[model samples]
Target chain A: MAHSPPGHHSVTGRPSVNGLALAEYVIYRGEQAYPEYLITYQIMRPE
Target chain B: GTILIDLSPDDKEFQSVEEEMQSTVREHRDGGHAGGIFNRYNILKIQKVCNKKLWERYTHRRKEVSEENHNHANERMLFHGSPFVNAIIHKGFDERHAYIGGMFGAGIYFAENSSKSNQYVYGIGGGTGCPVHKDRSCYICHRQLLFCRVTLGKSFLQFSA
Candidate 1:
């Protein structure tokens, strides 16, 4: 239901337009792409 | 001339990367498409065929059960357990009118009147110049979910035929 360039891929089933990475890059592989924003919020001290 | 950069490790690394990339691509392709999960077309096809077969089996068994019940009843109660008879009885059945209505089933109550025991008075029930013709009209007056009186006359019988 969403569009991306032919070679774009992800493991989490998130659409490509959401913009983590498009090309083949090992750094963005596997669990590495697990939402940096959520990880930062998890470490934050909620007052 | 001497070569020192051993290619074996690099070759192994390339192989691992290649395998991972292939798997990733396969996952993406399968997950991206609508008809990829367990052959959706085949699922729909099977559902249609099996649904029709199941319905046919249900109807056949129901008919058999109904015939068995009908054969068990006596002559005066031949119409017993029939939904049609039950419905007419629930609407309004007058024992007083039984002689005139013996061949037929029951006399429906007056639509304008709400009492179940009140049989419909033949003439001047609805109003003068009512759309329904008196001699040929029949009213389905029952206290059911759809509590509206339906008056069917000669024209309706003509169309039904």
Candidate 2:
């Protein structure tokens, strides 16, 4: 699901530890449609 | 805990496990919005597992609880988010590892809200994807989460900070 309000977020944007703030998405579990918020990361050796 | 069996399309537990995820999301979600803002995950697979060793310990502890307030009384399926999915699956939760604890502090947090768990989701060491922007095609990227059966026999309810 794209963040509401004339559009701001999606499943695309710069990545951060907090996740991509400008995006969101949806998917199927057991083939049933559902809504969710997701963040992808490529964490290096953390401090 | 040991054994992680991937759920095949025909796996009997496939639907059930997926249903658990859906249930938690529905129960805690905003019930949809005027702007069609309902969030969902991009999961491609699911797994069924059990850590019998740890489970036995949990049951033993639960058995110690007063009969009036025993374990499994307030258990519910919930969601967990983390950067280290495989780590937890193998090594299990370690509260001491929290990078920066929030709200209720560094505990193995679970949520009925998928969106909440989604916020902390992390992908593997693959910086391979895109976030939607001007006409640029974005490929699907992966992140991690867990659906768990959590116990809430007694707890604090937060309304306002």
Candidate 3:
């Protein structure tokens, strides 16, 4: 439970401070403030 | 803004960072600045409010959903809100510690490597630790990202109550 700035905000979220925009962005107003830098990397296999 | 840090979780960097955090705490405990202690306490205070809000909101949603489908109770934590700061702190403790700390610390393991944009991250398993004390199974938060961000969000707070 983390207090987020108002305006239809999520109550428990926040990822990398510097990552790519997630796909869900379009679902939430075309990307008002993408969780850029906020990513889930380890899930992907090494290249 | 800068690269800040870049090292594998198991690397030596992790150990050094952990040592540093312990030392820093020790230093502070030994008649050092009360800033860190005060800061943590402050952050906890703010997180409580946030947690309560979520609990209240979820309770409302559950009622609605329950009415629709009275199968059973729904217990899934959603991801949506503020900052992340565990690695940053662990980075202060040690690089390896920071790496692993940030990774496994949250039940969600490494989903991928560092992305081009944000360095901090946590995936599906990053849903626990929404409410402060509710998660007493282990002090090391299962949702590293959530815990860290919540802490940061709380840290930025400046309330009187």
Chain A accuracy as TM-score for every candidate: 0.15, 0.18, 0.17
- Candidate 1 clash pair list: none
TM-score of candidate 2 chain A against the true chain A? 0.18
Q: Model 2, stretches more than 4 Å misplaced?
A: A1-47, B23-38, B65-72, B97-100, B123-139
Please provide, for model 1 over A1-47, each residue's C-alpha lDDT reduced to its tens digit, 9 standing for 90 to 100.
Answer: 12112332111121344242222111111111111000000001113
Query: How high is the DockQ of candidate 2?
Result: 0.04
Share of real contacts kept by model 3? 0.00
Interface DockQ per candidate: 0.01, 0.04, 0.04
> A1-47, model 3: which lDDT tens digit per residue?
11223432212223343243221110111111111122111111113
- Of models 2 and 3, which has the larger lDDT? 2
Candidate No. with top TM-score: 2
Query: For each prediction, how big is the interface RMSD?
Result: 34.0, 15.3, 18.2
Instruction: Candidate 1: list runs displaced more than 4 Å.
Output: A1-47, B1-85, B88-109, B116-148, B153-161
Q: TM-score for every candidate vs. truth?
A: 0.12, 0.56, 0.21
